[PDB]
Amino acid sequence: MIVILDNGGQYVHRIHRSLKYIGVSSKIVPNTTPLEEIESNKEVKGIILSGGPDIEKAKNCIDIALNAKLPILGICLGHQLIALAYGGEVGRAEAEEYALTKVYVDKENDLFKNVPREFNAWASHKDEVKKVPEGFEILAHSDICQVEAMKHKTKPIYGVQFHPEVAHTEYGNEILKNFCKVCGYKFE
Template identity: 70%
Template sequence: MIVILNNGGQYVHRIQRSLKYLDVPAKIIPNSTTLEEIIADSEIKGIILSGGPDITKATNCENIALNSELPVLGICLGHQLISKAYGGEVSRADSEEYASIKIYVKEENDLFNGVPSEFTAWASHMDEVKVIPDCFEVLAYSDICGIESIKHKEKSIYGVQFHPEVSHTEYGDVILKNFCKKCGFEFEE
């Protein structure tokens, strides 16, 4: 099972539904849930930190990003929380994104395996990661956001600023499937 920490974003249920379409069991839980509560459930194989409107209300997400041994994917605000937890900088975007944008994948990697080097994604945010922590690398960027996706250099921790769970994002299902594979789920190809 994948747990989705609910940070109050408008697409939280879309994340759960997208995983359901992949036949991956998922459950939405409050962002006040502790890492200890999560790892006490042996069925949980991965964690998604959802988007949301307010970084100050994302209760336990930074602690989970720092201390989880389970794979973690941050989407939108979740991406920002991961970066902030490890010492990155998050601030107001130069240009707010509420539209389809072109994403450029820097090089083939496990999160974007099977995804072309350019694809269209849905963005909906006012803040963005400005500087990544030293232990992360940039996986993808757009013309208006230089850090659209990151990956921890040693752990299975990923972040995407855009929304792979919405239908406007090409290959969003592939990106989510790739994360689920990191969590130990297998798929017929």
């Protein structure tokens, strides 16, 4: 089963709601709870790091860094959580909302399935990684948001700046539906 942990972001309902419509069993867990709660289930298949204001205010962020054993897909602040964890940096670029984010021929052929090479997708340039850590590689880069998606090779870790949870997210539900499905698979 998939586990969804929130780090301050109230946009987690989109994670559990989407998975449901996709046919993937998952449960949401608050940050107030102890890390042992999520660390006690090492059998899980995948994890989703809901958005949030800052992952530097919660102590659970440390658990996500050591829980890399499983495929964790971070959103909004998620991608930023992996950076500070590896020793990177993050800042603000464009707080604007109404903006375009086209992505050229780039994909890990894993979660970006059912997606073409050149397509226009929605994404806010609020905050994105400003540092370039070692061991991580971008799977999808946009003409404006090159850090649209970052995955580590050393371990099964994934991160994204855009919010694929929302419906308006063009070509976003694909990465959220493809991933949640890859790890969503359960046994009876």
